Design a protein around this nucleic acid. Structure first.
Ligand SMILES: [Mg+2]
Ligand SMILES: [Mg+2]
Ligand SMILES: [Mg+2]
Ligand SMILES: [Mg+2]
Ligand SMILES: [Mg+2]
Ligand SMILES: [Mg+2]
Ligand SMILES: [Mg+2]
Ligand SMILES: [Mg+2]
Ligand SMILES: [Mg+2]
Ligand SMILES: [Mg+2]
Ligand SMILES: [Mg+2]
Ligand SMILES: [Mg+2]
Ligand SMILES: [Mg+2]
Ligand SMILES: [Mg+2]
Ligand SMILES: [Mg+2]
Ligand SMILES: [Mg+2]
Ligand SMILES: [Mg+2]
Ligand SMILES: [Mg+2]
Ligand SMILES: [Mg+2]
Ligand SMILES: [Mg+2]
Ligand SMILES: [Mg+2]
Ligand SMILES: [Mg+2]
Ligand SMILES: [Mg+2]
Ligand SMILES: [Mg+2]
Ligand SMILES: [Mg+2]
Ligand SMILES: [Mg+2]
Ligand SMILES: [Mg+2]
Ligand SMILES: [Mg+2]
Ligand SMILES: [Mg+2]
Ligand SMILES: [Mg+2]
Ligand SMILES: [Mg+2]
Ligand SMILES: [Mg+2]
Ligand SMILES: [Mg+2]
Ligand SMILES: [Mg+2]
Ligand SMILES: [Mg+2]
Ligand SMILES: [Mg+2]
Ligand SMILES: [Mg+2]
Ligand SMILES: [Mg+2]
Ligand SMILES: [Mg+2]
Ligand SMILES: [Mg+2]
Ligand SMILES: [Mg+2]
Ligand SMILES: [Mg+2]
Ligand SMILES: [Mg+2]
Ligand SMILES: [Mg+2]
Ligand SMILES: [Mg+2]
Ligand SMILES: [Mg+2]
Ligand SMILES: [Mg+2]
Ligand SMILES: [Mg+2]
Ligand SMILES: [Mg+2]
Ligand SMILES: [Mg+2]
Ligand SMILES: [Mg+2]
Ligand SMILES: [Mg+2]
Ligand SMILES: [Mg+2]
Ligand SMILES: [Mg+2]
Ligand SMILES: [Mg+2]
Ligand SMILES: [Mg+2]
Ligand SMILES: [Mg+2]
Ligand SMILES: [Mg+2]
Ligand SMILES: [Mg+2]
Ligand SMILES: [Mg+2]
Ligand SMILES: [Mg+2]
Ligand SMILES: [Mg+2]
Ligand SMILES: [Mg+2]
Ligand SMILES: [Mg+2]
Ligand SMILES: [Mg+2]
Ligand SMILES: [Mg+2]
Ligand SMILES: [Mg+2]
Ligand SMILES: [Mg+2]
Ligand SMILES: [Mg+2]
Ligand SMILES: [Mg+2]
Ligand SMILES: [Mg+2]
Ligand SMILES: [Mg+2]
Ligand SMILES: [Mg+2]
Ligand SMILES: [Mg+2]
Ligand SMILES: [Mg+2]
Ligand SMILES: [Mg+2]
Ligand SMILES: [Mg+2]
Ligand SMILES: [Mg+2]
Ligand SMILES: [Mg+2]
Ligand SMILES: [Mg+2]
Ligand SMILES: [Mg+2]
Ligand SMILES: [Mg+2]
Ligand SMILES: [Mg+2]
Ligand SMILES: [Mg+2]
Ligand SMILES: [Mg+2]
Ligand SMILES: [Mg+2]
Ligand SMILES: [Mg+2]
Ligand SMILES: [Mg+2]
Ligand SMILES: [Mg+2]
Ligand SMILES: [Mg+2]
Ligand SMILES: [Mg+2]
Ligand SMILES: [Mg+2]
Ligand SMILES: [Mg+2]
Lengths: 98, 46
RNA sequence: AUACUAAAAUUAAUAAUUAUAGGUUUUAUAUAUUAUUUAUAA
RNA sequence: UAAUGAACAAAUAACACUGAUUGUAAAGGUUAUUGAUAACGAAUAAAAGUUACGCUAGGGAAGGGUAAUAUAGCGAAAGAGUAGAUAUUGUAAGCUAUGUUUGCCACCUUCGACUCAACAUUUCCUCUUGGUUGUAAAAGCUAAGAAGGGUUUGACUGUUCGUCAAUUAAAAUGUUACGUGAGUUGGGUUAAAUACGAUGUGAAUCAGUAUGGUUCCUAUCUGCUGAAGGAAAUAUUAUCAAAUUAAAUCUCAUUAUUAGUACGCAAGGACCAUAAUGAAUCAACCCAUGGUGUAUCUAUUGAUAAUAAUAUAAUAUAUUUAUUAAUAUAUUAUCUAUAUUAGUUUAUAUUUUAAUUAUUAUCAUAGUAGAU
RNA sequence: AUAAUUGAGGUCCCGCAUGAAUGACGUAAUGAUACAACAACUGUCUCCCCUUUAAGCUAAGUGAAAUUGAAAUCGUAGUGAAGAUGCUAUGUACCUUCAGCAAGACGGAAAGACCCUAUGCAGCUUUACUGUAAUUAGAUAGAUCGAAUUAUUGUUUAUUAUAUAUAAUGAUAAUUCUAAUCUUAUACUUAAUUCUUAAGUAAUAUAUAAUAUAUAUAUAUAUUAUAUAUUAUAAGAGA
RNA sequence: UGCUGACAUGAGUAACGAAAAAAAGGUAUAAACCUUUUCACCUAAAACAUAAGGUUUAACUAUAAAAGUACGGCCCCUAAUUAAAUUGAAUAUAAAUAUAUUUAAGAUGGGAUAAUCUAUAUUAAUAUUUAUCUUAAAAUAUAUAAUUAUAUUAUAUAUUAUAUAUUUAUAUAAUAUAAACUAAUAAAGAUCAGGAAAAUUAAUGUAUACCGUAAUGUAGACCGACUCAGGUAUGUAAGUAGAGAAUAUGAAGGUGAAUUAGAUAAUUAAAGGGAAGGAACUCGGCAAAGAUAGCUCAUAAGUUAGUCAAUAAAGAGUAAUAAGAACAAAGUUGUACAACUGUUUACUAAAAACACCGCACUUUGCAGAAACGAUAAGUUUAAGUAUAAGGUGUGAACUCUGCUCCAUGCUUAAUAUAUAAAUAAAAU
RNA sequence: UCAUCUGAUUAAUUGUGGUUAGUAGUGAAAGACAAAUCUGGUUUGCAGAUAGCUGGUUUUCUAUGAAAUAUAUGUAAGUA
RNA sequence: UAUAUUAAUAAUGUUAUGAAUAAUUAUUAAUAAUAAUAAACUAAGUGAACUGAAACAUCU
């Protein structure tokens, strides 16, 4: 079909295929580009596939040695996400991947 | 297409947006409730 | 003959003559098998 | 005789006129002068466009008149016409007629196609006739009488028009609200959408271009096409009916004869008249031919229903036999129920008696084809 | 290309008045877009004919609508606010209808259609006029809301150069400090079950004075005493 | 074109709104109501169950029967969202009120037990959508532990015979059609990456609340002025035949209408056929006609390589050689415009206009740009961070995008430079 | 309404709720829609807005009885 | 569960194991709450436009 003549996306065979950890992902509310007044403050923004905003660490205060288990794809971020597992505490987390 | 069928009934919506409590629980709603009462209207609200 | 009208044909059943429509009979048309056959007897 | 400008608000000086408790002052007043509202009796110190997306209150604050123009004629004849202005042609000027074109006034606010046409003659063809050193014949030119009949089919274009092709005797000119939208169409023209070229700062605009784009009416009166009833009938009824009134029709071509004659060196080729074939229009008819033919018959796919005969079972009535069994008749029915792993359908086995033939019928566009 | 083409395709270029993201040009596919050509097909047409159903017509029941100054509502010519059922002249016409037609009654109603007027309305445009949100800038010559250092330069006083320096007073730019501003995150006891005040002391934090120790008057640690606290802490901007 | 009331003309005219009816009897009262028979229409509905709605219109006043186990509401829990509610002084604001946090409300959603019928209370302790492919093996047919081909890949419960606590349950072994279809785990492909919220034991306890329930619900019972050919959500929707919920019949059910009875003039609408021509019609093939498989093969040029072209046109295989239901199925080419699928003027314009993926420019460093906020707090941007977000133009892709910043802006550097406000002091 | 035609796994259709609207929302952009049609809805009030414009203004008798010119006017439909 | 809660009592049943203890019946003290409530007049805040000026903005 003519709509596939320009469909082009990178293929990373190492990206995870399973669902992310539920304990971190939270529901992403759709505002439709409308502020609390109801009016459309930001235009050209509308409905789309339902998504869950992932919680990605951007501080990394705790520190210590950590190992990544799976590199996943975040629907709400242009960048990938890495699921870290602490080598001592075992706590899990998501961080912007390099 | 054909028109005239603009009023599609529904008790829930009709009562929720034109009912007595739909007006007794708001400043503007109360004002029109008392205006109808002063005029002597029998049917204050839905 | 005709939109409704109008025109035209008959309304006989008697001592004698008259058929308007339906039905019936006869002939014919159409349809389509039939001589390898239809009705009869000897 | 032209050489000009009101008030208002300000400015300058003079007068001694008021001086908001009194004295001054401030401010006003009288007198003289100053500056431009040129849309020139000057609406503000200060203001341009677009609208087809538009809205409200009002006014009209193709017919008619005219005939410059256009068409046509008449008078006179400069000049062509081998000769001669008047066979034919007729510069420029003159006198007219029509209101068929382009105009002008403002009394008065849809072009083309389809269908049907009615009227005029300023006659395209057909009929009669005059002139034609330019009528030898035949074809022709010009003109007079003549409106009875006739006056096209395609390609292109929205076109009327026009170019072209093929025919005809001819493919005439107009009027009728440039006939005909309460008769049809609606391609152009225009309103909302859009784009191109040009104009504009733009919003938008165009004697521009292109695609798309809403009209309706059951006829009261007049008129017309047909059909009735009442009636007054030189006084009835049945029938036959003349004069009269209204209207229809009135034709045209090709060939043949006269005759290859008349005429003409030759080429070419008659008038007058007659007949036969047709064209166009109208009327009537269904014997025959083609169409139709929800009369009818035959063929055929799928599904369903029904009648009769046969087999089975039950009920009822008569007969035989011994309430059993059988014959005759009549009526009724060809079911049902379980298993095959949850549900439905089917198939088979199991239970009961749960049949085959024959001829119909309905539905599928008249189901469909062939006939009629 | 057709018998014949103002239409279509190719080509030529005095392009009235094309042209490169108001994009330029050539394709494949797509398109209920517009125009044109070929094959088949047909009642579109020559040229209309027959048939079926629902109306139309008749009888019974029920029963609207736009319209309507009053009508006893004919033709022709002329006249006329200029196209006459109604005026003038003349002609024709016995009275009343039914099914049709749609030439007139400038037929009827929505609603047409264009102009002109109004010192009428509304939308849109702009370097029309007049405001204004918004944005920008100044007011130690306003407030909230203060200072220090460094560098350049302006003007002047005593002293000098000639027929250039010191100092004062400002301005400009940068840097730094802050309880100026601003942002971000998170125990006992008396006196009036719980609350509050109050003398004393417990423990934490801050500041000052004294004593002792260790290094090069200064730094660091410990003890004693006095004063305060039981909205703060951390980060950032900062006169 | 005055307001209201009454009555006229049009006029006993148009019309009575998709349609099959007929006889006998209720009833010597019936076209219209009831019953019986015949005929017909709807039948993946005009049937059967429902939701919402509604003058209860129903088979009616003597009237619509619930502890729950497929019965819904009610009740617990929340989404979008709402709130004169809550927080010397939550923040902001001429009032109205707005913002942020809590709390409460809010189904279109989630909520254990159950025919071998089940027990909800009190106290105490601690899951987006989507498919079941290939190999294997068993079993089967022709052939000889080898090979070809073939239904099946997993569950759904009955019978027979055995072992366990002892005729109640489990387990074992054998038997038992095909095509659809249902809920549950299984396995696994893509990016468009897929809701929120409310524990177990031990003892005790249950006398089962209130409301909905008729009929109509593809319509005479709702929204449309009407007993209006319009609008209205869900599940079955017999069989025969088919790929199919297409199309044909129709078992059962319902149904055949506030208009009837005659001839069917001219004329109108919807259909059937039509000789000889076959677009001559017409602005323009508008309309109508045209189908030699529906399965299996085959299928060109061009081309962005995509059976795009393409369901290619013509053609072939299967009984058809004169035909006999319905539905699906209607050619080729050139040019202009647009890349394409899509959106648009409810009710005259569906297009060449909008959008589009793509290209390009530009603003914003997050205490940000953009927007809203009588105006602020604040909100969307975003729980995002220059490969992101906002604005602008062009608009897939091949070959390309030449020139100039004069004018309007934008942007950088210059105390080159006038001017407003604000102030002291000092001369007339 | 009928015939014909288009999409029919998607930028799809649809049920039940909720938010955004009158200087004002939504809008794949048409001056489209906001309860039978918006270049900005409806209701109430200012309000008997204003109208140099249109229409209307009702019994009788009697006597007199014009003008449509000039000037000025953002004035030629008005007025002095 | 205001026919309510706590406490006390008399009895019953009654667990617990005479007394206690709650459950119940019945008395007494304490513990608690019901906003439809007018219109006009007055004062205060904000504050238009149509209109007149025969236009219009100062003005109204
Ligand atoms: Mg955007
Ligand atoms: Mg209504
Ligand atoms: Mg609502
Ligand atoms: Mg007799
Ligand atoms: Mg006879
Ligand atoms: Mg006889
Ligand atoms: Mg007879
Ligand atoms: Mg003045
Ligand atoms: Mg004096
Ligand atoms: Mg004084
Ligand atoms: Mg003075
Ligand atoms: Mg002016
Ligand atoms: Mg236009
Ligand atoms: Mg004239
Ligand atoms: Mg001469
Ligand atoms: Mg002359
Ligand atoms: Mg003559
Ligand atoms: Mg001659
Ligand atoms: Mg004669
Ligand atoms: Mg005409
Ligand atoms: Mg004419
Ligand atoms: Mg242009
Ligand atoms: Mg079209
Ligand atoms: Mg006679
Ligand atoms: Mg004669
Ligand atoms: Mg004739
Ligand atoms: Mg015949
Ligand atoms: Mg015959
Ligand atoms: Mg014949
Ligand atoms: Mg015949
Ligand atoms: Mg049927
Ligand atoms: Mg040509
Ligand atoms: Mg043509
Ligand atoms: Mg060309
Ligand atoms: Mg450009
Ligand atoms: Mg192409
Ligand atoms: Mg009648
Ligand atoms: Mg006349
Ligand atoms: Mg007369
Ligand atoms: Mg007429
Ligand atoms: Mg008629
Ligand atoms: Mg004027
Ligand atoms: Mg009156
Ligand atoms: Mg009539
Ligand atoms: Mg009639
Ligand atoms: Mg009738
Ligand atoms: Mg009867
Ligand atoms: Mg069907
Ligand atoms: Mg079926
Ligand atoms: Mg039902
Ligand atoms: Mg709740
Ligand atoms: Mg629910
Ligand atoms: Mg019900
Ligand atoms: Mg029921
Ligand atoms: Mg209906
Ligand atoms: Mg209703
Ligand atoms: Mg049946
Ligand atoms: Mg029913
Ligand atoms: Mg009916
Ligand atoms: Mg034919
Ligand atoms: Mg033929
Ligand atoms: Mg033609
Ligand atoms: Mg023609
Ligand atoms: Mg067609
Ligand atoms: Mg190829
Ligand atoms: Mg088809
Ligand atoms: Mg080209
Ligand atoms: Mg397109
Ligand atoms: Mg499309
Ligand atoms: Mg439209
Ligand atoms: Mg359309
Ligand atoms: Mg994009
Ligand atoms: Mg901003
Ligand atoms: Mg961007
Ligand atoms: Mg564009
Ligand atoms: Mg491109
Ligand atoms: Mg383009
Ligand atoms: Mg360029
Ligand atoms: Mg100054
Ligand atoms: Mg398609
Ligand atoms: Mg399709
Ligand atoms: Mg898909
Ligand atoms: Mg426009
Ligand atoms: Mg309305
Ligand atoms: Mg609109
Ligand atoms: Mg007023
Ligand atoms: Mg008024
Ligand atoms: Mg007098
Ligand atoms: Mg006079
Ligand atoms: Mg003036
Ligand atoms: Mg005047
Ligand atoms: Mg005037
Ligand atoms: Mg005024």
């Amino acid at each position: 079909s003519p709509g596939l003549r320009w469909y082009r996306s990178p293929i990373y065979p190492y990206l995870y295929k399973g669902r992310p950890v539920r304990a971190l992902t939270v529901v992403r509310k759709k505002h439709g580009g409308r502020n609390n007044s109801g009016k459309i403050t930001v235009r050209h923004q509308g409905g789309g596939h339902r998504n869950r905003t992932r919680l990605i660490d951007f501080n990394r205060w705790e520190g210590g040695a950590q190992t990544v288990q799976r590199i996943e794809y975040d629907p709400g971020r242009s960048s990938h996400i890495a699921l870290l597992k602490h080598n001592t505490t075992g706590e899990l987390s998501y961080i912007i991947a390099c | 297409k054909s028109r005239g069928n603009t009023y599609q009934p529904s008790t829930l919506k009709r009562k929720r947006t034109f009912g007595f409590l739909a007006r007794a629980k708001s400043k503007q709603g109360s004002k029109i409730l008392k205006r109808r009462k002063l005029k002597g209207r029998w049917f204050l609200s839905h």
